[PDB]
Design an enzyme around this catalytic site. Sequence first.
Site, mmCIF file in Angstrom:
data_model
loop_
_atom_site.group_PDB
_atom_site.id
_atom_site.type_symbol
_atom_site.label_atom_id
_atom_site.label_comp_id
_atom_site.label_asym_id
_atom_site.label_seq_id
_atom_site.Cartn_x
_atom_site.Cartn_y
_atom_site.Cartn_z
ATOM 1 N N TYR A 27 0.758 -1.258 0.000
ATOM 2 C CA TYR A 27 0.000 0.000 0.000
ATOM 3 C C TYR A 27 0.791 1.312 0.000
ATOM 4 O O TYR A 27 0.279 2.337 -0.474
ATOM 5 C CB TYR A 27 -0.986 0.002 1.167
ATOM 6 C CG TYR A 27 -2.090 -0.989 0.938
ATOM 7 C CD1 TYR A 27 -3.238 -0.628 0.270
ATOM 8 C CD2 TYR A 27 -1.959 -2.307 1.358
ATOM 9 C CE1 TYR A 27 -4.252 -1.545 0.043
ATOM 10 C CE2 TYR A 27 -2.958 -3.229 1.134
ATOM 11 C CZ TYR A 27 -4.099 -2.846 0.465
ATOM 12 O OH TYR A 27 -5.091 -3.763 0.236
ATOM 13 N N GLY A 29 2.798 3.971 -1.372
ATOM 14 C CA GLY A 29 3.228 4.388 -2.684
ATOM 15 C C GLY A 29 2.192 4.000 -3.712
ATOM 16 O O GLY A 29 0.998 3.981 -3.432
ATOM 17 N N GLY A 31 1.214 1.108 -5.136
ATOM 18 C CA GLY A 31 0.326 -0.032 -4.885
ATOM 19 C C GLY A 31 -0.898 0.304 -4.044
ATOM 20 O O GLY A 31 -0.832 1.174 -3.181
ATOM 21 N N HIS A 47 -4.588 4.971 4.942
ATOM 22 C CA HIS A 47 -4.353 6.231 4.212
ATOM 23 C C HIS A 47 -4.972 6.195 2.806
ATOM 24 O O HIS A 47 -5.666 7.121 2.377
ATOM 25 C CB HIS A 47 -2.856 6.548 4.174
ATOM 26 C CG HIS A 47 -2.541 7.877 3.569
ATOM 27 N ND1 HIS A 47 -2.002 8.012 2.310
ATOM 28 C CD2 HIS A 47 -2.709 9.135 4.043
ATOM 29 C CE1 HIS A 47 -1.834 9.298 2.045
ATOM 30 N NE2 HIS A 47 -2.281 10.001 3.069
ATOM 31 N N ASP A 48 -4.720 5.121 2.075
ATOM 32 C CA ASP A 48 -5.288 4.960 0.762
ATOM 33 C C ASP A 48 -6.818 4.963 0.826
ATOM 34 O O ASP A 48 -7.448 5.551 0.009
ATOM 35 C CB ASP A 48 -4.855 3.618 0.163
ATOM 36 C CG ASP A 48 -3.417 3.616 -0.370
ATOM 37 O OD1 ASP A 48 -2.719 4.667 -0.435
ATOM 38 O OD2 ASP A 48 -2.901 2.540 -0.757
ATOM 39 N N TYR A 51 -8.112 8.468 1.352
ATOM 40 C CA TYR A 51 -8.132 9.210 0.109
ATOM 41 C C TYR A 51 -9.322 8.825 -0.757
ATOM 42 O O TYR A 51 -9.933 9.687 -1.398
ATOM 43 C CB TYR A 51 -6.856 8.985 -0.681
ATOM 44 C CG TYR A 51 -5.706 9.943 -0.338
ATOM 45 C CD1 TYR A 51 -5.683 10.666 0.837
ATOM 46 C CD2 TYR A 51 -4.649 10.085 -1.198
ATOM 47 C CE1 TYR A 51 -4.614 11.521 1.146
ATOM 48 C CE2 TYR A 51 -3.584 10.931 -0.910
ATOM 49 C CZ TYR A 51 -3.569 11.641 0.250
ATOM 50 O OH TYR A 51 -2.492 12.456 0.488
ATOM 51 N N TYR A 67 -3.880 22.091 1.385
ATOM 52 C CA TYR A 67 -4.584 22.379 2.612
ATOM 53 C C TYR A 67 -3.717 23.286 3.478
ATOM 54 O O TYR A 67 -2.619 23.637 3.095
ATOM 55 C CB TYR A 67 -4.956 21.089 3.365
ATOM 56 C CG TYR A 67 -3.878 20.031 3.434
ATOM 57 C CD1 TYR A 67 -2.770 20.209 4.229
ATOM 58 C CD2 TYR A 67 -3.975 18.846 2.699
ATOM 59 C CE1 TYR A 67 -1.784 19.267 4.294
ATOM 60 C CE2 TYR A 67 -3.012 17.888 2.765
ATOM 61 C CZ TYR A 67 -1.897 18.101 3.566
ATOM 62 O OH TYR A 67 -0.886 17.173 3.673
ATOM 63 N N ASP A 93 -3.674 12.637 5.849
ATOM 64 C CA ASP A 93 -2.217 12.756 5.842
ATOM 65 C C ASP A 93 -1.606 12.805 7.250
ATOM 66 O O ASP A 93 -0.584 12.130 7.548
ATOM 67 C CB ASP A 93 -1.790 14.011 5.066
ATOM 68 C CG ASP A 93 -1.957 13.865 3.552
ATOM 69 O OD1 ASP A 93 -2.362 12.768 3.068
ATOM 70 O OD2 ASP A 93 -1.721 14.809 2.751
HETATM 71 C C1 LIG Z 1 3.081 7.274 -4.524
HETATM 72 C C2 LIG Z 1 2.309 8.499 -4.109
HETATM 73 O O1 LIG Z 1 1.934 9.287 -4.968
HETATM 74 O O2 LIG Z 1 1.978 8.809 -2.704
HETATM 75 C C3 LIG Z 1 2.603 8.396 -1.546
HETATM 76 C C4 LIG Z 1 3.753 8.951 -1.003
HETATM 77 C C5 LIG Z 1 4.306 8.444 0.151
HETATM 78 C C6 LIG Z 1 3.739 7.380 0.827
HETATM 79 C C7 LIG Z 1 2.580 6.763 0.360
HETATM 80 C C8 LIG Z 1 1.999 7.199 -0.843
HETATM 81 C C9 LIG Z 1 0.720 6.588 -1.328
HETATM 82 O O3 LIG Z 1 0.166 6.943 -2.354
HETATM 83 O O4 LIG Z 1 0.182 5.543 -0.713
HETATM 84 CA CA LIG Z 2 -1.058 3.478 -2.188
#
Ligand SMILES: CC(=O)Oc1ccccc1C(=O)O
Ligand SMILES: [Ca+2]
Length: 119
Positions: A27, A29, A31, A47-48, A51, A67, A93
């Site tokens: 998750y 980044g 993924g 977090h994902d 969003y 923000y 965040d």
């Molecule tokens: C890859 C991305 O755009 O966002 C992030 C940056 C740092 C940590 C996590 C993420 C994410 O999207 O989950």
């Molecule tokens: Ca992600």
Amino acid sequence: NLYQFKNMIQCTVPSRSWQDFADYGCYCGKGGSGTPVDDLDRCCQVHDNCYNEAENISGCRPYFKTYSYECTQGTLTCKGDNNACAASVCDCDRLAAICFAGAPYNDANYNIDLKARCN
Ligand SMILES: CC(=O)Oc1ccccc1C(=O)O
Ligand SMILES: [Ca+2]
């Protein structure tokens, strides 16, 4: 926005490069699927999910919404001048940054093969 999220991370976890969290588990980044590999990955799953929920607000784009927040003397605050979208994304965040600071970092789970281990 992502620039701000990066800054929150630098603020709560000054001992690691922000990049360390940019490609971790299933998750953190790019993924966004499968079973979270560990507690840090669970921070990113929530977090994902956070969003995804914010995207339901008309015109609300979490990666790009700027923000209003502050990080001073070890404290992250989302400010009162935020509209519904900004307030939601800022909290997504903030909570993740705090979550990252309390989670163990396993070098073995950095840059894992998403196609094979996250579906
Ligand atoms: C890859 C991305 O755009 O966002 C992030 C940056 C740092 C940590 C996590 C993420 C994410 O999207 O989950
Ligand atoms: Ca992600």
